[PDB]
Design a protein around this ligand. Structure first.
Ligand code: FMN
Ligand code: FMN
Lengths: 117, 117
């Protein structure tokens, strides 16, 4: 579990983050709770992927996209961000969940372990 | 594990698929091994997301995107497809892995179970 929960009734502020998120990004709760996760973005982050994200959230749609993000120490990393709306019984969006995967090289070795009969 | 492995030295033909893939899509190995996974696409599949996928594969890049796909019975489903290149020691791309997530509604209930201290 690397994920965060954002509150649609407080302008998509992060209301919760998993332990994995703090460890992946190196930021602590003081930098995250109550904030918008756009703070991870930085030089080179793709403007059009960011716009796709924004639209998906506005439309209440699930989404995924690779985005460049930055750790607290300024290390760039690729983040496969998937997003899903959480609705109430009225069918209104009250939260979003986001799941963050830090891309690493997938090796022939790891594939063998994945495929091994 | 829902994933498939494609062989870059046989034009991205699927060389392996996990049990989860057969069950998610309802297709059997006879419809999958040796094929290109584009066969899951259909009416309404987003042309530009498909083009993003194509470019990522050509550039040897990791990627994610939501795509409409179809099960064997013709049921449409949203597929959060993530892709990652597998390189040899020369640094050349010899395979791709693809991981397929079938989007379902995420409920306030599921979130409570995810967040529950
Ligand atoms: C639940 C959730 C998680 C998010 N996680 C990230 C993330 O890890 N990295 C990131 O760059 N953007 C993330 N975002 C996206 C930003 O919060 C923001 O929605 C995006 O940059 C587009 O809006 P903007 O154009 O106002 O910045 C997340 C959004 C949501 C709703
Ligand atoms: C490993 C791997 C897995 C893929 N899985 C899917 C999938 O589940 N659904 C899909 O619609 N496309 C999938 N694709 C994408 C298609 O195979 C194809 O690359 C895409 O449609 C773009 O190429 P085209 O424009 O020639 O169709 C996958 C590709 C790779 C390499």
């Amino acid at each position: 579990h690397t994920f965060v929960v954002a509150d649609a009734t407080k302008d998509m502020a992060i209301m919760y983050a998993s332990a994995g998120f703090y460890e992946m990004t190196q930021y602590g709760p003081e930098d995250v709770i109550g904030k918008n996760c756009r703070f991870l973005q930085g030089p080179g982050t793709d403007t059009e992927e960011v716009a796709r994200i924004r639209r998906a959230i506005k439309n209440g749609e699930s989404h995924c996209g690779r985005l460049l993000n930055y750790k607290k120490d300024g290390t760039p990393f690729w983040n496969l961000l998937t997003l899903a709306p959480i609705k109430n019984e009225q069918g209104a969006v009250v939260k979003f969940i986001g799941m963050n995967v830090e891309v690493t090289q997938f090796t022939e070795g790891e594939l063998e372990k994945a495929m091994r009969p």
